[model samples]
Target: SRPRILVPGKINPRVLERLPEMFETVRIERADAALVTADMRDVSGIAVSGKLPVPLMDAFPSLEIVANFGVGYDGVDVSRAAARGIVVTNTPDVLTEEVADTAIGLLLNTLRLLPQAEQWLRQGRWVREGAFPLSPLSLRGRTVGLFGLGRIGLAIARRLEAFGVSIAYHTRTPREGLGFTYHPTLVGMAEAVDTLIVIVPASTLKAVNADVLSALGPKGVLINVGRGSTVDEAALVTALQNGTIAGAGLDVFENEPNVPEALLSFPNVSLLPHVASASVVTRNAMSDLVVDNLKAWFSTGEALTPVAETPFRRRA
Candidate 1:
């Protein structure tokens, strides 16, 4: 029999038919917990989204590789997979520009109060009161602190710099060659910048809590393109509302698609439905890369965009 691979989500209709021809591919939805039991029976490779956890590894002892659909791998417990000799891969590079664009958009919207201005115009209120908040924050001549300086973060840096923004970053260790100021701690970086852009790992939970938010002070705004957990959602809400922090632009939240009621009430907050990298051109490219990653793993027992391990590279 030919080698078999188990893919975790419904494949794009076109890729579904093509995949079966190359390998005995099985489709399992991560929502169905029972599928993990069945996956152990025969599959050798596992193509994943950020859903399957380490426990699945116990069920599929024969699994040799995990191909992630997106660049983020918070879904798979890489350490557990690595201990079992399972290689984990992701699709990067292709989504960099799209995500970076989103970061810029979010920053502009939040700082310049674009959404609020549009809302007032549509409501016929701006015509009555010609002058609005006279001095909304400008992107130009402001310092932006990036939580993680990976591919998307670096890309965001490049784009924001053109707007005359000074870029600073905080990582586990300094990117010694990047030529940007490196803050030894996230709190320090948060204090230094007017806007703090989070582009770290999605799996990172509670990286910035009440204390960190407090460190940011009342003048700081936060822009999270990374995972929601990276920022303490509850604490962030408290900070924003209680005048502890100025504002925030959020893409991914701790509980996605559903945001906290308190955050919704805040005029200074902007929330997106995790479509930071969902442009037609970018998504199509990402899909092709996903298929290519699977093809590479099957042909050479390796992946082109393998997930980086310890001292994790922010970019795949």
Candidate 2:
């Protein structure tokens, strides 16, 4: 018999429809614990994007795997699932190129002021007001420090090298063989480089605070492509106001879909609605990974990309 999978809320079209091809699907409006019932006890898997609490997982006693929809699966209670012998899988690497591309784009736009230049043209400033103000910053001859140097960060650094920029990175441990300079401390990295790119998930209780920005100096630029929680929102505002840092280009925020009014008022800053990997091609690839994990788990008794916490593999 084909195992039944639980799906809550909306998911990517590629995964949503493809799921039915491999297993029976049970749909619900949301991932609320209240929505889980005794009738759903036999569900063998969960396909979801956002939060999925323990209570919801407990409701499905027969659950074997969870195919979370994105690269960042922090919303799911993965550790608890580990204790229960349930595997939690998230799509990783599929969006690496897309996110790295966005990171580089944010960096260039923050320095070059491209978005504001386009806006000036749209406002007819080219004709009526004259040429847009000359940019206060330039990417030329700038040193970039990556706050985290994982796969995506490495990709961003590769792209930066092509632009003829010097690169450095901060990690508790060095990556062994890389030409980019490595700093054991985040603050030290900030002091060494003018551009800081944040790509870590969190630990990150406003990790990028005033002290770090002060070291980054007035000519510095900050680009965040990781989670919103990693940067201290209030500190960033203060840094900008005090001219501690030159500008910021952010794709993720402290509270998403809602940005600080102070941040909105900055002419030097560039913001995006967390659309780092929102393109159809990238999203579909992510969706395929989700469905593929489910297919891999049931068919081979091991997940294709299980998080470090849930490292389970079937013995033949």
Candidate 3:
């Protein structure tokens, strides 16, 4: 059967070329492209790198497993996949260090106003303006609230502690006396910190909204190294405009390459082009994880890093 494997995303050519030997390779230009609909049926296995919609799941009844190329799988429709008993997996723990570094980098950039400062340099206003906007918040001596204290979040905590910062995290579980306190509620955590680092699962494109932003307070700094859908774009803009929050650093957004017009006008925000796991070392490692998981699934009828399979009702 050639171990019918449907690859729904583009991969490193080196990995892509070698896929045919292990399984039948179906090529697609981009992970989010519409091409995947063609080979949905009759696929024993599938590889994905983008958000998989519910409709896509209904189309692929025979899909036994999903091998996500990246560490995050917020793009996949978890409930639908689980209903079918499909094994969904992602590459985690491999890029924890790199992603943690990115989170701290974002935090520092927002706190120091580095991105705005760089722009001011090229705008030729250094001498005429006389002085620059002084950064108010610094990482040192500040309490950092992390929304999800997963492996990457803990790694960020370790690095932040070296700078003499206090750590508070809010998760489903508690990790006490690890030099970080746990906040059982998001509102409680928001009120306790001067800086907030959002590193959690982004279930969909519209998950984070105004209520979530409001919890962070006016003096808080928000840094998101997680999925774009995990933030409320409109509320974030309002927060910056009304001085509801001190500043922000965002690596991902609701839509890629199309940033909100309000975000472009703010000097208080540091926006990245969303390449947190872009290094050659980590990218290749992600690719390797994808292939390894694929190999295991085809050979053993199981996956290496399966997705969370609990059932859930849509929040109304």
Q: Indicate which candidate wins on lDDT.
A: 2
Residues 242-307, candidate 2, lDDT per residue (tens digit)? 888999999987667898899999988999998888899999999999999999988889899998
Whole-model alpha-carbon lDDT for candidate 1: 0.77
The sequence of per-residue lDDT tens digits that candidate 3 reaches over residues 1-316 is 7767766555665557667768887655555435666644676767767766665555555777777778877778776777777777888888899998888888888888887787787788797885568888777667889888788988898998889888898877787567578888776888788787888842434334566567777778888888777777887888788888888899987788788888988877888888788788988888777778778777765567776673222211
Per-candidate TM-scores read 0.86, 0.96, 0.84
Per TM-score, the best of the predicted structures is: 2
Candidate 2, 129: how far from true, in Å?
0.9
Against the reference, the lDDT scores of all candidates come to 0.77, 0.87, 0.75
Tell me how far candidate 2 lies from the true structure as C-alpha RMSD in angstroms: 1.5
lDDT of 2 at 94: 92
Please list the Cα RMSD from the true structure of every candidate, rounded to 1 decimal place.
Answer: 4.1, 1.5, 5.0
Tens digit of per-residue lDDT, candidate 1, span 1-316:
6667777665545455556656787777763446666535877777655578566655775666776778887778888877666777777999988889988898889888888888878888878987567435666667888898788988999998788778899888787678889998888887787778888843457888887788877778889999887888788888987989888899997776798888889888888889888787776777666667667766765677887772221212
Which pairs in model 2 have colliding backbones? none
